[PDB]
Amino acid sequence: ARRGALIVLEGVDRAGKSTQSRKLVEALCAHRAELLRFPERSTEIGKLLSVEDHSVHLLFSANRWEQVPLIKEKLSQGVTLVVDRYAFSGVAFTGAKENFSLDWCKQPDVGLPKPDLVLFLQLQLADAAKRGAFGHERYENGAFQERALRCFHQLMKDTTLNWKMVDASKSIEAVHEDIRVLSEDAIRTATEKPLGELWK
Amino acid sequence: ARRGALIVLEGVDRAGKSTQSRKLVEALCAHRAELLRFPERSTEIGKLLSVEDHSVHLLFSANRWEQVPLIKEKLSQGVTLVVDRYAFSGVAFTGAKENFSLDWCKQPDVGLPKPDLVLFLQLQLADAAKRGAFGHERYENGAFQERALRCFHQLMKDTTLNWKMVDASKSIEAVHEDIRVLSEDAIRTATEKPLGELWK
Ligand SMILES: Nc1ncnc2c1ncn2[C@@H]1O[C@H](COP(=O)(O)OP(=O)(O)O)[C@@H](O)[C@H]1O
Ligand SMILES: Nc1ncnc2c1ncn2[C@@H]1O[C@H](COP(=O)(O)OP(=O)(O)O)[C@@H](O)[C@H]1O
Ligand SMILES: Cc1cn(C/C=C/CP(=O)(O)OP(=O)(O)O)c(=O)[nH]c1=O
Ligand SMILES: Cc1cn(C/C=C/CP(=O)(O)OP(=O)(O)O)c(=O)[nH]c1=O
Ligand SMILES: [Mg+2]
Ligand SMILES: [Mg+2]
Numbered sequence: 001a002r003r004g005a006l007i008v009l010e011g012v013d014r015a016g017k018s019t020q021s022r023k024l025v026e027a028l029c030a031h032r033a034e035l036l037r038f039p040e041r042s043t044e045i046g047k048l049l050s051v052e053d054h055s056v057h058l059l060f061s062a063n064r065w066e067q068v069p070l071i072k073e074k075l076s077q078g079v080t081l082v083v084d085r086y087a088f089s090g091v092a093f094t095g096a097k098e099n100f101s102l103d104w105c106k107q108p109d110v111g112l113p114k115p116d117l118v119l120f121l122q123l124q125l126a127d128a129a130k131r132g133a134f135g136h137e138r139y140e141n142g143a144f145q146e147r148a149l150r151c152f153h154q155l156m157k158d159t160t161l162n163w164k165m166v167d168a169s170k171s172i173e174a175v176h177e178d179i180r181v182l183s184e185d186a187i188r189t190a191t192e193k194p195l196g197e198l199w200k
Numbered sequence: 201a202r203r204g205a206l207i208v209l210e211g212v213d214r215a216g217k218s219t220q221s222r223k224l225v226e227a228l229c230a231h232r233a234e235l236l237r238f239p240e241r242s243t244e245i246g247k248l249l250s251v252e253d254h255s256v257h258l259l260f261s262a263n264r265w266e267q268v269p270l271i272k273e274k275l276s277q278g279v280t281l282v283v284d285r286y287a288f289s290g291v292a293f294t295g296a297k298e299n300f301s302l303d304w305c306k307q308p309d310v311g312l313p314k315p316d317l318v319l320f321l322q323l324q325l326a327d328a329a330k331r332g333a334f335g336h337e338r339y340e341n342g343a344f345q346e347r348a349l350r351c352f353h354q355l356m357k358d359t360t361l362n363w364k365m366v367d368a369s370k371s372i373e374a375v376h377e378d379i380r381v382l383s384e385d386a387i388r389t390a391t392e393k394p395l396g397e398l399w400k
Binding site: 111 | 244252254259261262265268284300304307308
């Protein structure tokens with residue numbers, strides 16, 4: 001009764017997370033795999049996120065926590081979950097707003113299902129800035145993006161998490177190939193041990 | 201331009217918090233004072249609280265955080281705020297559900313406006329159990345009430361907070377008299393220093 005893997009895709013805005021997450025799920029299914037995106041706008045907590053920045057940070061964490069019974073059930077059924085943004089983006093975005101410390105930002109997400117694999121989609125900030133995605137002012141805020149990346153860097157220092165850096169500057173097919181190999185390795189190997197808990 | 205005091209009334213279910221909070225505000229106004237109750241059911245976050253216990257805990261904290269701009273503005277205007285339950289009840293109730301540690305429960309409320317006075321309405325659990333208030337199953341859950349009290353006790357160990365224990369077993373008028381003297385002392389004295397931050 002082999003459990004599914006919990007795979008998280010992280011990285012700055014326009015790194016290719018939505019593109020690569022959908023590509024991964026569909027390729028795995030062509031294995032039992034499902035896609036999860038944070039924030040999940042469909043729930044009641046998600047509908048509130050559609051000001052007070054601490055409330056917003058907590059609402060983003062409560063949106064992750066409300067999906068925990070679903071996460072655990074799917075994983076126990078043998079379904080691998082591909083997650084487009086998790087607690088790491090939560091800490092990075094609030095940390096990019098800068099008013100609050102990394103320690104305060106991490107705390108609400110402490111205890112969440114620990115990912116078996118955290119894919120960090122790395123690319124130069126100037127490389128992501130020249131990408132075909134618009135619709136958010138924060139994309140053009142260079143300073144915000146630099147602070148968000150600094151937050152991601154500090155979070156990668158945690159030796160307990162299975163962080164795997166992927167060169168996100170490469171072609172759609174080459175980035176997919178790297179993500180596919182690492183994800184398949186996680187489904188076969190990382191699933192041997194029971195599902196852990198984030199930052200504890 | 202003397203700021204208002206932030207006064208919090210705490211204690212187990214049926215200690216007399218709703219009774220004493222309304223009595224205090226109206227007596228002070230007979231001074232500029234307003235009543236605040238947590239949870240505040242009128243807001244959007246409050247409307248969600250009207251399951252997943254971590255999400256609920258975070259929603260209760262986000263409900264406190266959304267009132268922070270209002271709290272700071274009222275206090276700066278010279279309005280004393282009388283608060284019926286705060287972060288202490290947040291930590292006590294989730295702690296009474298028991299699955300989570302006091303440290304995790306405290307973290308989301310870290311940074312909130314620090315009360316100038318925390319009134320703890322003490323009375324024997326058996327004294328509160330024989331009181332004229334019903335409508336909640338948790339009132340009859342003796343074990344839950346004992347754990348909630350244990351959580352309140354641990355929170356009172358914090359030497360940085362101005363905790364004042366009041367004998368809540370006494371008559372409505374005698375409990376009011378004690379709360380009135382301590383509240384008036386806080387309005388005159390505690391307001392000298394700037395508004396602090398909870399648990400930091
Ligand atoms: N390897 C790639 N090379 C160039 N553009 C890409 C690549 N992968 C994705 N994109 C494009 O970059 C933009 C952002 O991709 P997206 O998947 O939305 O990233 P994210 O979800 O990380 O913000 C989109 O316009 C997408 O089509
Ligand atoms: N000093 C008191 N002696 C006896 N009953 C009291 C006293 N103060 C309040 N009560 C009653 O006890 C019950 C709970 O009071 P309440 O203000 O709702 O407490 P809480 O808000 O702490 O749960 C009510 O029925 C109230 O009328
Ligand atoms: C997880 C997570 C995400 N975001 C950023 C919020 C992103 C939601 P959007 O900007 O409306 O949509 P796209 O970034 O997908 O284009 C955040 O601020 N905190 C979080 O915990
Ligand atoms: C602050 C706060 C309160 N409560 C308990 C929730 C109480 C709301 P009710 O039980 O519906 O109403 P009455 O207790 O006033 O009768 C909680 O669980 N967490 C908190 O942060
Ligand atoms: Mg995306
Ligand atoms: Mg009450």
